[PDB]
Design an enzyme around this catalytic site. Sequence first.
Site, mmCIF file in Angstrom:
data_model
loop_
_atom_site.group_PDB
_atom_site.id
_atom_site.type_symbol
_atom_site.label_atom_id
_atom_site.label_comp_id
_atom_site.label_asym_id
_atom_site.label_seq_id
_atom_site.Cartn_x
_atom_site.Cartn_y
_atom_site.Cartn_z
ATOM 1 N N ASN A 1 0.878 -1.455 -0.041
ATOM 2 C CA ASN A 1 0.057 0.117 0.096
ATOM 3 C C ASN A 1 0.760 1.154 -0.017
ATOM 4 O OD1 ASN A 1 -1.745 -1.800 2.340
ATOM 5 N ND2 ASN A 1 -2.869 -1.258 0.437
ATOM 6 N N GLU B 1 -5.776 -4.616 -4.127
ATOM 7 C CA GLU B 1 -6.375 -5.627 -4.370
ATOM 8 C C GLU B 1 -8.068 -5.530 -4.945
ATOM 9 O OE1 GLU B 1 -4.715 -4.206 -1.583
ATOM 10 O OE2 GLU B 1 -5.893 -4.359 0.229
HETATM 11 O O1 LIG Z 1 -5.763 0.263 6.499
HETATM 12 C C1 LIG Z 1 -5.185 -0.758 5.836
HETATM 13 N N1 LIG Z 1 -4.432 -1.767 6.670
HETATM 14 C C2 LIG Z 1 -4.298 -1.567 8.022
HETATM 15 C C3 LIG Z 1 -5.618 -2.023 8.766
HETATM 16 C C4 LIG Z 1 -5.491 -2.039 10.443
HETATM 17 C C5 LIG Z 1 -4.227 -1.857 11.004
HETATM 18 C C6 LIG Z 1 -4.139 -1.717 12.357
HETATM 19 N N2 LIG Z 1 -3.055 -2.652 12.807
HETATM 20 C C7 LIG Z 1 -2.903 -4.071 12.656
HETATM 21 C C8 LIG Z 1 -1.927 -4.730 13.087
HETATM 22 C C9 LIG Z 1 -1.461 -3.561 14.078
HETATM 23 C C10 LIG Z 1 -0.468 -3.611 14.949
HETATM 24 N N3 LIG Z 1 -0.226 -2.356 15.566
HETATM 25 C C11 LIG Z 1 -0.666 -1.264 15.265
HETATM 26 C C12 LIG Z 1 -1.857 -1.179 14.383
HETATM 27 C C13 LIG Z 1 -2.196 -2.363 13.848
HETATM 28 C C14 LIG Z 1 -5.367 -0.886 4.370
HETATM 29 C C15 LIG Z 1 -6.246 -0.095 3.785
HETATM 30 C C16 LIG Z 1 -6.638 -0.299 2.263
HETATM 31 C C17 LIG Z 1 -7.444 0.557 1.625
HETATM 32 C C18 LIG Z 1 -7.028 1.008 0.313
HETATM 33 C C19 LIG Z 1 -8.136 1.857 -0.378
HETATM 34 C C20 LIG Z 1 -9.428 2.015 0.389
HETATM 35 F F1 LIG Z 1 -10.256 2.851 -0.382
HETATM 36 C C21 LIG Z 1 -9.681 1.837 1.661
HETATM 37 C C22 LIG Z 1 -8.740 1.249 2.317
HETATM 38 C C23 LIG Z 1 -5.889 -1.322 1.653
HETATM 39 C C24 LIG Z 1 -4.868 -2.180 2.210
HETATM 40 O O2 LIG Z 1 -4.250 -3.122 1.590
HETATM 41 C C25 LIG Z 1 -4.736 -2.010 3.463
HETATM 42 O O3 LIG Z 1 -3.864 -2.816 4.187
HETATM 43 CL CL LIG Z 2 -6.314 -8.773 -6.876
HETATM 44 MG MG LIG Z 3 -2.814 -3.714 2.794
#
Ligand SMILES: O=C(NCC/C=C/Cn1ccc2cnccc21)c1cc(-c2ccc(F)cc2)cc(O)c1O
Ligand SMILES: [Cl-]
Ligand SMILES: [Mg+2]
EC number: 2.1.1.6
Length: 214
Positions: A169, A198
Site C-alpha cells: 500500500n 486488491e
Molecule cells: O488500512 C489498511 N491496513 C491496515 C488495517 C489495520 C491496521 C491496524 N493494525 C493492525 C496490526 C497492528 C499493529 N499495531 C498497530 C496497528 C495495527 C489498508 C487499507 C486499504 C485501503 C485501500 C483503499 C481504500 F479506499 C480503503 C482502504 C488497503 C490495504 O491493503 C490496507 O492494508
Molecule cells: Cl487482486
Molecule cells: Mg494492505
Amino acid sequence: GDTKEQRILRYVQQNAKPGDPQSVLEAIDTYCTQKEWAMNVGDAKGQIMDAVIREYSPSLVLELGAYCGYSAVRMARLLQPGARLLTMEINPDCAAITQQMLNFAGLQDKVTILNGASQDLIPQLKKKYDVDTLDMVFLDHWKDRYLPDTLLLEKCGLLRKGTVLLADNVIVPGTPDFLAYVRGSSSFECTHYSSYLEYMKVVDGLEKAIYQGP
Ligand SMILES: O=C(NCC/C=C/Cn1ccc2cnccc21)c1cc(-c2ccc(F)cc2)cc(O)c1O
Ligand SMILES: [Cl-]
Ligand SMILES: [Mg+2]
Ligand SMILES: [Cl-]
C-alpha cells in the site's frame, strides 16, 4: 449481525479444502471479487510477494497487520520446514479470524499470532519471543506506522544486513514518509514493484527495502 470478516471466514470454511492453503487463498479472492471488497493483499500483489518469499526463503518473518490471515497464509505456505512467521494484530476480532483461517489452512504450526500494538510488541520480541534478528518484515498495518516501526525495529536490534522489508500500500492509501525515508537512506536498498490495489483497477505497489546495516 455478523461482520464482513466473519463472512469471509465462513466462506472459506464452506468453499475451500481443509489443509489446502491455495484453496483458501482462492476462496478469499473469489469472495472479495464477487461479494464484498476487503483489504486483503489480494492475488496481484500476492504474486509479487510469492516471488520475493521464494527468492529469499526467510527462516523468520514478522508481519505487521494480519487482518483475516490472507497474507499470513500466502507467506506461510511457502516457508521451508521449521521456518516461522510472527504476525502482529491489534484488533482482537481479527486476531481470532486470522487464527481460525490459519487453522483451517493447516498452517497453525508455522505461525504465531500476536494480539497487540506494534509499538508495544516490537520491544518484546527479543526477550519474550526469543527473536535474535528478523529475515523479512511485511508491513501492512497503519500506513502512518511504517516509518516509526521501521525505526523502532532498528533501535531494538532486530534488523541485520540483508533483512528484507516488504511494504504493502505504498501508493494507496500511501506511505509517503516511509518511501521518502527508505529511498533516501544509504541504509536501505529499495525497489518498487508496481501493481494494483486488491480486487480493483487502481494502481498500487509494494516497496522492497533491504537493510544494509548502520
Ligand atoms: O488500512 C489498511 N491496513 C491496515 C488495517 C489495520 C491496521 C491496524 N493494525 C493492525 C496490526 C497492528 C499493529 N499495531 C498497530 C496497528 C495495527 C489498508 C487499507 C486499504 C485501503 C485501500 C483503499 C481504500 F479506499 C480503503 C482502504 C488497503 C490495504 O491493503 C490496507 O492494508
Ligand atoms: Cl487482486
Ligand atoms: Mg494492505
Ligand atoms: Cl492480507
